[PDB]
Structure 1
Amino acid sequence: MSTYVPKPSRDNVYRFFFTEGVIACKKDRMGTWTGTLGGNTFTVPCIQVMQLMRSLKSRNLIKEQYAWRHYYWTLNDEGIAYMRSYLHLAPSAMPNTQKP
């Protein structure tokens, strides 16, 4: 597919990434990635998700783990701060992995 990521698609992925602090995606270029954002489902191509997460990893904002044709990206503390500023959320906002 095309690596060129539309800005709304990036915003949806980042909102999902912050809401659920982990994104798991199969490594297939001609594949589709599905996520749920406060209800409903939005679809991003798997290759574009890989591109966005590769950029984040190069900036040391996330931790990447790979196993059986699947990626497992987790936001770091720096990544949480980055997403909170990028998404213009309140400082009290936290991913679901951190809520009590």
Structure 2
Amino acid sequence: MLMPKEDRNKIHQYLFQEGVVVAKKDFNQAKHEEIDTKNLYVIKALQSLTSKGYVKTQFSWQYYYYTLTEEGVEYLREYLNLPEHIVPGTYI
């Protein structure tokens, strides 16, 4: 993917912010409903993460389900943020 760097930042921060992405299996879907980027970018960015680890995907009823694993939460820190921040629902 070309996927310009200011759109990795929107995708990767939101995955850090909540820990989950669902995103609607439909390519060329023109501005995904939660992140301000395209829906094709959301599906293909997190395919790159999944093949190397870092996130687990579930597919059901034309929808994806992305869950940030423990090897990905530590990696996504230095990509975007500083330490001692909790991505997932681990925050009580």
Q: Please, what TM-score do these two structures have when normalized by structure 2? A: 0.90
Equivalent position of 1:98 in the other structure:
90
- Aligned ranges for residues 33-72 of structure 1 at < 5 Å? 33-35=32-34, 42-72=35-65
Pairs aligned (count): 91
> Which deviations, in whole Å up to 9, do the C-alpha atoms of 1:41-76 show, x marking residues without a partner?
x42111111110010001111000011111111110
Equivalent position of 1:17 in the other structure:
15
- Please list every run of 5 or more consecutive structure 2 residues that lacks an aligned counterpart in the other structure: none
Structure ranking higher in helix proportion: 2
- CA separation of 1:96 and 1:58: change in aligned 2, threshold 3 A: closer
Q: Please, what TM-score do these two structures have when normalized by structure 1? A: 0.84
- Please list every run of 5 or more consecutive structure 1 residues that lacks an aligned counterpart in the other structure: 36-41
**Misfit runs of 4+, over 2 Å:** none
Equivalent position of 1:84 in the other structure:
77
Identity %: 32
Q: CA deviation at 1:96?
A: 4.3
CA RMSD of aligned residues (A): 1.3
> Which deviations, in whole Å up to 9, do the C-alpha atoms of 1:15-53 show, x marking residues without a partner?
100010001101111213132xxxxxx421111111100
How far apart are the structure 2 equivalents of 1:15 and 1:77? Answer: 16
Structure ranking higher in strand proportion: 1
